[model samples]
Target: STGSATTTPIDSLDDAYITPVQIGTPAQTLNLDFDTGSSDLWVFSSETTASEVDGQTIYTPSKSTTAKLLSGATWSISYGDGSSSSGDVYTDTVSVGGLTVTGQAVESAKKVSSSFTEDSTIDGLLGLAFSTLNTVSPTQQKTFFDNAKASLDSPVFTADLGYHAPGTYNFGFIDTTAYTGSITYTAVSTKQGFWEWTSTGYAVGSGTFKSTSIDGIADTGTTLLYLPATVVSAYWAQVSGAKSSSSVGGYVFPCSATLPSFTFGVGSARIVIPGDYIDFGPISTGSSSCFGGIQSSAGIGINIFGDVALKAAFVVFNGATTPTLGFASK
Candidate 1:
């Protein structure tokens, strides 16, 4: 048996792909960000101040017969974007697609940062990474996927992310039709609670492939593909009018520039990121300069193969005895 859910683009540049999730009895629905970067099924809830929530939907625990407060248990999490939220805990029935995890630890947010509150469309974050990344106190919590994995025919989930189009995230089974060519996989280092791996090397455009290895995490919640400072500079140098912006920071290029393909090596296989994908889009409507989808991972330390890079391929987040990540073109 398989459990699948449709993932829809939620922002410009295909920044956030959201999915619907059923929480509690009778199924109170919430649009949540299915993020692989963290683990915590946290949602805006009645505990939050009404004024701070704005137009975002909040889950009311009392309204759901299955919702139960996990006395004294709490959670607080911060993200790479500096967005954060903290709140109490609840054990409720959480369902996704055809999979259900009974008595799931749901973090009901009592407070959210300004950035999260401003994202009025995002009702919550459904963490899909390793359960070790979970932030609940007293006892770490297991993600919905983890709770359901034991009964799954195949212990795996596939993320078919799309750029401004339809995509699907499937569990227990991989949809062979969603990807093309053979899937090239790499060993994943779960020590950091992330799908962290090292690319043998990368090439800027069609130039020679660099043999210098680079380590990074495959993060679905982030928007841009963040690389080292030198790597980012090399890519910008190939394009005309691509300069470091003093005011805006990062590299901004002429909207009409024809970007060259960026290639990342996974063992012997080369996965190419299309030129247009690197162009992103205009920084704003009618703006002459456009933000580069590839940026420097200066302060962030580890590079991030975020949505910008992941969307160009089908990703298999293999949860077998040993975690591994498989990549294949769409």
Candidate 2:
């Protein structure tokens, strides 16, 4: 009824977190990125073109006795980062931590974008978003979480992300010791197939909190925190030489500058992200300019509270019929 797994940052920059997943009867253990922004549990596999495969591990369903083809079913999905993948579908026994789901829909990639091929840290993506966002054709498929929710003790999951360190993902129950203070709950809108909610306001380092509403999605898949241009400008203004650049694709500042911490409101609670987490390391190796972990969401259309923000708190993804989100300081 409950399960847990340790997730580690795939890279030094904490770009994404990956956790081990078991697929098929023989158990092909692949390190997969748990993405809450999309809804297709697609993986690199024997079906992936040889040219598209790199050092990443591939899932070969033919070797699993429990793997069954979902005849004629197919799927294709693209990400905001421009990465994409598509392939046939199969129903197989999949397990996360100790949670198992027999007949879980597993998408085997036959084609993948170059961006994915170059990144060998992840073998695939396990979608946590709503099943309505699933890309399979003919008959839509349920995500691993959806299929297992019924068996989970509470039909909920929690994410405790860390900075350059190992974190944890827990299902079925909230680990009371994982956070401090009382948890703040907020209604979420799944109409967009995302864990979307409205934030109360924000405060730059020692500045006063502005009581305004900012709507955005809580996405574990995205790498940075993206907000409105005005909000992003306000935070960057505090840094002497910070500027948004088209060449850099985001705001960058001198590596020597003192970065200020950022805080955002969740109902009556406030979560603060340390300044060091925002430095995001140098723009290039040995470069004096460092890219920011927070950027303007103008180009993205919708704001996204990604790993940069989630790492600062303990987040709960409640999957009950009336879905809600819970946040608490850790």
Candidate 3:
């Protein structure tokens, strides 16, 4: 039977800006952002602006003996945070683990922001989601999965995350032992290439909330779990000592005790976001106020389950079989 794939959002931290994964022989590391909304592997380059390249590590062609540039292609990307970068295209011998894939498409940014340039920990982003949004042109397009699909023993990638710590995003293999019985697989939509689905509803502490059914998207680019205002308010109400203060951003709460466990129902599957994860990186605003992970967004169209929610399960993206997302044990 075909196995069900799950989705996990990749989290980025203050110290770790990008997830470093091995690419090509001789062990050249490619900095990647495990994004589910899009699938593309981009890297910072020497040609990037010095201001934008402040604390960020750029892969210098001179440093790598195998680096090669693509003559005519140019690339640019903008994020929801108003951050943007533009650069030229390049191809290099990319490798992950023991698998080697030649001529993988990579973006070399010419300009970026301080958040990206000044970040000392991670230098680039590696997209491990579906290939439909891949920037690689049809003539030149080839994802990490496309190249290694034939060579992989199981034709699947598993994402295992450690709570508040860096996790391992492994490819080319699937661990069936972590899940109960067999995994359930969902078909992917061809329109936008994003893994789309209708969540049954939202529940907390075994109680399902009314009118809480929402259209949700699993995104790695966003760090916080974005939900509607009502949903956010209700969720915070469940947390012990959670309060709304003027000084802190909307919903501020004390990390006094374990909050209620909330789950997003997806038909047959219920993806649970643990209480500890909600308060994992609570930042103090001032003398005596603190805020949990929940935040507000004006108009995002759909709820985004970011790194805060993704750390709980193992995610697998199957482009070979169909546009499907699988979840398993972390």
Candidate with maximal TM-score: 2
User: What TM-score does prediction 1 earn?
Assistant: 0.96
lDDT of 3 by residue, 192-281 (tens): 556665566677655775534566666665666777777777787777777766565456666555677777655567778777666634
Off by over 4 Å in 2: none
Model 2 C-alpha lDDT per residue in residues 132-189, reported as the tens digit of each score: 9999999999998999999999999999999899999998999999999989998899
Colliding pairs, model 1: none
Clashes of 1: 0
Each candidate structure's TM-score, on Cα atoms with residue i matched to residue i, is: 0.96, 0.99, 0.82
Q: lDDT of each prediction vs. the true structure?
A: 0.88, 0.95, 0.62
Model 1 lDDT at residue 54: 80
User: Residue-wise lDDT of candidate 1 within 146-212, one digit each (tens)?
Assistant: 8888888798898888877878889999888998888999999999998899888889887999987
Give lDDT for model 1: 0.88
For each of the candidates, the C-alpha root-mean-square deviation to the true structure, in angstroms, is 1.4, 0.6, 4.3
